[PDB]
Design a protein around this ligand. Structure first.
Ligand SMILES: [Cl-]
Ligand SMILES: [Cl-]
Ligand SMILES: [Cl-]
Ligand SMILES: [Cl-]
Ligand SMILES: [Cl-]
Ligand SMILES: [Cl-]
Ligand SMILES: [Cl-]
Ligand SMILES: [Cl-]
Ligand SMILES: [Cl-]
Ligand SMILES: [Cl-]
Ligand SMILES: [Cl-]
Ligand SMILES: [Cl-]
Ligand SMILES: [Cl-]
Ligand SMILES: [Cl-]
Ligand SMILES: [Cl-]
Ligand SMILES: [Cl-]
Ligand SMILES: [Cl-]
Ligand SMILES: [Cl-]
Ligand SMILES: [Cl-]
Ligand SMILES: [Cl-]
Ligand SMILES: [Cl-]
Ligand SMILES: [Cl-]
Ligand SMILES: [Cl-]
Ligand SMILES: [Cl-]
Ligand SMILES: [Mg+2]
Ligand SMILES: [Mg+2]
Ligand SMILES: [Mg+2]
Ligand SMILES: [Mg+2]
Ligand SMILES: [Mg+2]
Ligand SMILES: [Mg+2]
Ligand SMILES: [Mg+2]
Ligand SMILES: [Mg+2]
Ligand SMILES: [Mg+2]
Ligand SMILES: [Mg+2]
Ligand SMILES: [Mg+2]
Ligand SMILES: [Mg+2]
Ligand SMILES: [Mg+2]
Ligand SMILES: [Mg+2]
Ligand SMILES: [Mg+2]
Ligand SMILES: [Mg+2]
Ligand SMILES: [Mg+2]
Ligand SMILES: [Mg+2]
Ligand SMILES: [Mg+2]
Ligand SMILES: [Mg+2]
Ligand SMILES: [Mg+2]
Ligand SMILES: [Mg+2]
Ligand SMILES: [Mg+2]
Ligand SMILES: [Mg+2]
Ligand SMILES: [Mg+2]
Ligand SMILES: [Mg+2]
Ligand SMILES: [Mg+2]
Ligand SMILES: [Mg+2]
Ligand SMILES: [Mg+2]
Ligand SMILES: [Mg+2]
Ligand SMILES: [Mg+2]
Ligand SMILES: [Mg+2]
Ligand SMILES: [Mg+2]
Ligand SMILES: [Mg+2]
Ligand SMILES: [Mg+2]
Ligand SMILES: [Mg+2]
Ligand SMILES: [Mg+2]
Ligand SMILES: [Mg+2]
Ligand SMILES: [Mg+2]
Ligand SMILES: [Mg+2]
Ligand SMILES: [Mg+2]
Lengths: 174, 174, 174, 174, 174, 174
């Protein structure tokens, strides 16, 4: 119960929202992990898709860690939840994985936007700045990159052209 | 259904056991993550406990990844499950965290030993070698290190001596 | 007849099996040699297929040499046999060569697995360790790589697309 | 009585066997020490035989130390015994010393093989791996080297040719 | 049937003769391989004989490869045959191995001379130049070196003097 | 029986005394070896005590070797005896180990002093100089260092303070 000695201008609702966001970032890490190893299957075998999604997975773990650090910086208390498995076991194709990643990042961005709204409603400028500085432009860049990737794959003839996915793997992700 | 072109001498039971082990390693990663940020709380404030457990968390993620790679190398199919949250939100003390980590690593080791027994019963020497080479001695070393740590903390007067935990933090984990 | 001064715990059946395995490795070297120069024909002209299979040929000669060294280390006696010519003179296509290499490596792996079973039945842990350390994971990696290659070529449109085989030659084997 | 906190899957019989093996390695160190200084006598005066056996003596001390470390890693308890003096005070000749070293290393290897059998019967894969990784191939290499040395000395005309032992000292051990 | 686009002034008899020569070079590689590991036996133990013959074995594999490349350069088609095992399993002595190698190289040289005669009869100056440039002087040098070696071993008292073979191993092959 | 060609002014009693001293130095090496691994136990876990005593163990082996060399330099003949196991299996504490080491080094010093008395009574100045130069001041320094260590541990509150032994381990032995 008793307060943290550091706590100031940090609403309990913001504290809870940061714990939800921690879960979401870990969930995103897990989705990209799954995607990565899909492309490492002997019957998929797109090694640069695999590295690309692994890198993205590790990023998301870093995003989670930074929110954990924030929780403590502000005197909130971290409460972890189960990290749900991804929706898919088999991601179908390079294009479909990229489409799923785009939708994931748009979902993560919507959560961060709700979090910023809350921080604004509770007049927490430090939390607003945090989210703006470390998260919002990362999301906009990730979303733009994924859209670019989907566009290229589509134009190249994916998913039906295995050639298209192979060449994208070498030229864009390589 | 149809076979993987790479698959040879890889029993379905071993395939399932590797998927269980993947979950366990990710679970271990999560426990150490939680422990790490506990020591980063302003009311705990043992920064080298925090770094030590973070490093251990990242290790475990690497151990999971290597099993995922193995699954694919052998032509098995990765099936992920929810990563359960840790048993504890509050780890009590440096000593109690170390005790919990020891019990975690002994549990992980017991799983790997059951996995090796299975691999032996199914006459899978490649899988036996894998487990021996990459996992079993890591576990024995981790277990020994954690026991050493618990011993020192106990001898120093933890958990009642906050001095003991502070000085261990600086001299052993620092 | 009279024993080797070094010989210990080395069954005559293991000695014979190692001589068979020596022949098999040299045979594998010969198959890859043949494949290599097929891709060097003026009417095939895929120079990176050619280098890839030449490298694999030299590897296999090294694998044979290490078994010869082992035979002597254990006090067995090397008995060489004719190295049979490969099954094919003309390997048809990049894809078909890769398919044949996959089947070759799976055959070599099955032989090594039978050899390990024998070594296990004769309670020869040094020989078990030898095979595990120097051979079994090499086979699993070779098999996985070849499967990956076959998958890519298939997805790209080989063997009918001469473009697919040309581009694979440059991007994967180059 | 009470258990070690680290102990897992480590049979008391294996614990005792490791203590016996520790004694044997120290015993081997002592035999090579004695051999070394024999060749340093003014009436023997083969300085490279002396260095060769001293190096081998120090190796064996390292092999003992690694088993001591293992005992502790696994939660067993080290119990030392007297290190018996070697069988011989006077080793007769370079050839006879080499012959005695060959028989010593074959004895040490037989002990390690019995130890591996025990570890296998008690389903201790970590201990099996330990012995395989750190000991069995060292023994096979040592045995092969000693056999090679005995062969050369014999072919050269030792022990009757003092010239043979002198020249072996310079060309093989030098 | 249909011609190679590159083929010019390349008689079918020369094409067949190059395929025979390819087999012979691989056969020579195999003889030297066998010789090499004979000297690696614990009861022979002449390590520089072993390295010398291994080097010669690898050379011969290179000589085969260059003929394979030639076949393709000229638009002929490679047809491989079984590589026969060597005549001997046990090479008796350093001197006898050297004598056998001399006879092998003289046989290989006689084949190359017949090949040059054919190339001359078919007015193939490119093939004549090839053989002259890459093969004939190599043979003359190899033959001279082997004769020199046999002479020295004979003068030193081989094969009865094990000392002679030991010292040759160190001073000439070392 | 017959004399060594090198022997001069070297009494048989001195020869025997040097053989006894060789045994004592090896015995000291063994005591420190045992002490070292005691501190490596998971329930003791003082790693710098362990390194300190291991270093001391290796020193003593060097002291033995130098006496063996001396025996031969003077034309005496080395006669080895069993190296007795240490008095203790369990050394109780850092303080008690240090106390036992102090008593060991004082015993070794008393032996060397008796040896010097003998060398003096037999008018062997070379042996007197040997002992003075290589042994007596080493003993005085070792004894002083061990006394210093015991004093510090005692003042710090050992053996009851596990904190004291931990901090000594880091600051003095570290
Ligand atoms: Cl607040
Ligand atoms: Cl609030
Ligand atoms: Cl939950
Ligand atoms: Cl930007
Ligand atoms: Cl299977
Ligand atoms: Cl199955
Ligand atoms: Cl689940
Ligand atoms: Cl280790
Ligand atoms: Cl045997
Ligand atoms: Cl047998
Ligand atoms: Cl045959
Ligand atoms: Cl691997
Ligand atoms: Cl146990
Ligand atoms: Cl037990
Ligand atoms: Cl005893
Ligand atoms: Cl080896
Ligand atoms: Cl023509
Ligand atoms: Cl023609
Ligand atoms: Cl044939
Ligand atoms: Cl010349
Ligand atoms: Cl005298
Ligand atoms: Cl006297
Ligand atoms: Cl005795
Ligand atoms: Cl001083
Ligand atoms: Mg959520
Ligand atoms: Mg891969
Ligand atoms: Mg990202
Ligand atoms: Mg994120
Ligand atoms: Mg669910
Ligand atoms: Mg989706
Ligand atoms: Mg910014
Ligand atoms: Mg589980
Ligand atoms: Mg902090
Ligand atoms: Mg770890
Ligand atoms: Mg793990
Ligand atoms: Mg739950
Ligand atoms: Mg717990
Ligand atoms: Mg290992
Ligand atoms: Mg065969
Ligand atoms: Mg070419
Ligand atoms: Mg290969
Ligand atoms: Mg092979
Ligand atoms: Mg045939
Ligand atoms: Mg085929
Ligand atoms: Mg390995
Ligand atoms: Mg014994
Ligand atoms: Mg000397
Ligand atoms: Mg050795
Ligand atoms: Mg040893
Ligand atoms: Mg006795
Ligand atoms: Mg003997
Ligand atoms: Mg090894
Ligand atoms: Mg022929
Ligand atoms: Mg050798
Ligand atoms: Mg040559
Ligand atoms: Mg040739
Ligand atoms: Mg035949
Ligand atoms: Mg012959
Ligand atoms: Mg020339
Ligand atoms: Mg004594
Ligand atoms: Mg330790
Ligand atoms: Mg000392
Ligand atoms: Mg001493
Ligand atoms: Mg004592
Ligand atoms: Mg002095």
């Amino acid at each position: 119960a008793s307060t943290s000695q550091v706590r100031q201008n940090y609403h309990q609702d913001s504290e809870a929202a940061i714990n939800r966001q921690i879960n979401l970032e870990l969930y995103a890490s897990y989705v990209y992990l799954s995607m990565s190893y899909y492309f490492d299957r002997d019957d998929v075998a797109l090694k640069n898709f695999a590295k690309y999604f692994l890198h993205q997975s590790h990023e998301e773990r870093e995003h989670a860690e930074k929110l954990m650090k924030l929780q403590n910086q502000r005197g909130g208390r971290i409460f972890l939840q189960d990290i749900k498995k991804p929706d898919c076991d088999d991601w179908e194709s390079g294009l479909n994985a990229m489409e799923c990643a785009l939708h994931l990042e748009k979902n993560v961005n919507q959560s961060l936007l709700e979090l910023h709204k809350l921080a604004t409603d509770k007049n927490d400028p430090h939390l607003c700045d945090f989210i703006e500085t470390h998260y919002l432009n990362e999301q906009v860049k990730a979303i733009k990159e994924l859209g670019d990737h989907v566009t290229n794959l589509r134009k190249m003839g994916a998913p039906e052209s295995g050639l298209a996915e192979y060449l994208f793997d070498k030229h864009t992700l390589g």
